Design a protein around this ligand. Structure first.
Ligand SMILES: [Zn+2]
Ligand SMILES: [Zn+2]
Length: 227
């Protein structure tokens, strides 16, 4: 990592890690319990302007979501304008009920709601097809569907003021394996990520759904992996 903004790990408990990666954005990392490999890390993104934030992805469960919400409200001293699960799997949406219990507006791609309901998961209350821009303070965030890949509903988040891309599980960390393909369209995945890369050429940081963030190289790696 050689970004002009030197990343800072500003919070660490047994269950949640916050890593500041730009002046006003932060990776949230929590864990998914798998009966096979123990706890595996899962990422989301917090963006902030003044005393307002937007969160991409929930932790897998309400307890960790509550820890995250209380950290934002209690330590970042900010309101949460919105939460945006980037796909229907638990590592993006499993802890959504906690956000609803705080009356935090939730948004996802329409297909995320459809696939969530098919699995009797709690789903967001608002939907879009195929992008939305939401205000955070005097800035905005983009949430957009570019095509199928890891799942058929996966969306990405972009914070243009700091050129931060939250790729979600559509994006892989460098050298990652292909991961869980049970819900994937591997035929479209590379083309989808090519579209993301074309749309955000000035990207500075790319955050994958699991593992280590980096720069545009994660886009190139993920494209190549699925060709
Ligand atoms: Zn997934
Ligand atoms: Zn994932």
């Amino acid at each position: 990592h050689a970004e002009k903004f030197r990343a800072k790990e500003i919070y660490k408990s047994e269950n949640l890690i916050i890593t500041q990666i730009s002046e006003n954005s932060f990776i949230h990392t929590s864990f998914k319990q798998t009966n096979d490999f123990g706890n595996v890390p899962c990422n989301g993104l917090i963006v902030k302007n003044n005393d307002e934030t937007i969160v991409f992805d929930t932790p897998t469960n309400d307890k960790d979501s509550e820890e995250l919400i209380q950290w934002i409200t209690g330590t970042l001293h900010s309101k949460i304008n919105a939460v945006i699960p980037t796909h229907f799997h638990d590592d993006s949406m499993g802890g959504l009920q906690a956000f609803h219990n705080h009356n935090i507006p939730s948004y996802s791609y329409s297909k995320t709601i459809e696939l969530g309901k098919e699995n009797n998961f709690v789903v967001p209350k608002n939907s879009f097809n195929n992008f939305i821009t939401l205000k955070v303070g005097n800035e905005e965030v983009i949430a957009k569907f570019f095509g199928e890949g890891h799942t058929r509903d996966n969306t990405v988040g972009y914070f243009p003021s700091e050129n931060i891309l939250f790729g979600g599980c559509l994006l892989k960390e460098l050298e990652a394996s292909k991961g869980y393909l049970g819900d994937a369209n591997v035929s479209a995945w590379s083309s989808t990520v090519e579209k993301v890369k074309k749309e955000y050429p000035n990207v500075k940081i790319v955050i994958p759904g699991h593992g280590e963030y980096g720069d545009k190289k994660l886009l190139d790696y993920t494209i190549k992996l699925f060709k």
